[model samples]
Target: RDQRREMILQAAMQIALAEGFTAMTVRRIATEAQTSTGQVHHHFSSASHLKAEAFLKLMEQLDEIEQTLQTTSQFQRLFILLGAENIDRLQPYLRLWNEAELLIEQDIEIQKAYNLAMQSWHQAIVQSIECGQKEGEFKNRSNSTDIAWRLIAFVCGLEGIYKLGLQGLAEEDFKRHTEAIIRLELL
Candidate 1:
């Protein structure tokens, strides 16, 4: 049942990534999962619930990735994940954020879930920063949570710019500029 639930979540994410989150419906998810609407309903009562579950699953995957970085330095993990290759891989997440702009207003619970997920990620980064400071790897004067929030804002802004460029509202130069900005900010 757990595996089947995961399949539904993955199918939903793949459809959202390929099409858009708005394109995701219980009926569509059922079709994608090669299951019946009854099965989907048995798992999730509504589309919003399914979306919330899928987003939470994505967060769990991120937590697993962070755990793998436990032995590595925070800066190293940041660089590797934010590098061009990895960032491109994360485009689906960025795209979801873009789609969420409108949905968040309509669904309070979904917005809260999204916010909590982001807070969890921010807390992990902050904890890593604090660890670095204790080990004399980062400046002692730095505040981990503050720095983490700043980094989150920076990355979110970069994603916004990338999405804009992808929509042809901006130029390719925006991507180059955001890459430079990330490197400079991390340093």
Candidate 2:
């Protein structure tokens, strides 16, 4: 039987090293692929165009997951993302962001990818804030874009710092800090 639990770590490392699609994407199939080289190309792709295309689709999956969760209240959706039970679902993205941080520092293409992804996310939040204000849910003086940026910056900053292992900070403070952002940005 395959040691699937143990393989996730390997998979992560492979993804992190994804030259196009992680280090393992280049690997000649091992006892693992039983899942190997030809199989990977079969699954991920063969042509250069396909490699970039398939890899991009994988990246977009993160954004799609957020779309799947929507609620009548923007704040409720915010809380669900960072709240106790649901927050665990967010753990994987932290490392992906970390890797993106370093990768972007070197690769402008990655930076472009990062900006587009984040801008789409920011736009979504901006829409939510606009809805809240117009409908009497938020009732704030701040422009919707301003408030959206503030909230996004807060979540990004807090998550980035915590993931970076910043001293004098605790992960438990995530919610308090988010509530603070919610308060500052809205009613």
Candidate 3:
């Protein structure tokens, strides 16, 4: 049952990635999974619930990536994940963000979840900066939190540029641009 539920969630995510969140219907997800709608409905009470579950699953994947970041340079981890190829893994979340921008005003829970997720990422970056400082890799900064937020905002802005350049651009373009952005702080 767990496996089947995961399959449904994966299918829902794939559908969201391929056709956008608006296309992620129960029937479409079931069709993607090659399962019946009844199976999906049995696992999720409603389509919105399924979407919530799928988003959480994606968050779990991000958590794994975060764990891996502990073994490498934080900037490297962030750059690699935000790169074009790896960013594709996050397309579903981007779609959700695009489609649900207005929903946050109406739904307190959604807003809370969004804020928490954003906060978590910010905290992780801040922690990485602290680590870099302790290791003498980063210059002492009075406002690590501000630096972290700036990095997050920068990456978020680049995501749109990356999407726009799509096909015509390469991941190196993102990496080079990000490096330049960070290099500005060194002087």
Number of colliding residue pairs in each model: 0, 4, 0
Quantify all predictions' global Cα lDDT against the true fold: 0.68, 0.57, 0.67
Per-model TM-score on C-alpha atoms: 0.72, 0.66, 0.65
- Compared with the true structure, what per-residue lDDT tens digits does model 2 show for residues 102-132? 6666555556666776776677778877877
Question: Can you give the lDDT of residue 173 in candidate 1?
Answer: 55
**Model 1 misses residue 158 by how many Å?**
6.0
- Candidate 1 clashing pairs, residues 3+ apart or interchain: none
Report the number of the highest-lDDT candidate. Answer: 1
lDDT-wise, the better of 1 and 3 is 1
Model 2 alpha-carbon drift over 4 Å, by segment: 1-24, 28-56, 70-72, 80-86, 163-167
Candidate 1 residues lying further than 4 Å off, grouped into runs, are 1-3, 62-73, 80-86, 157-187
Candidate 3 — which residues are off by over 4 angstroms? 62-73, 81-112, 157-181, 184-187
Tens-digit lDDT string for candidate 3 (36-124): 98998899887777765665556556656546544466556545434333455555555565555555676554455566667776777
Which candidate wins on TM-score?
1
Model 3: how far residue 81 lies from native, Å: 5.3
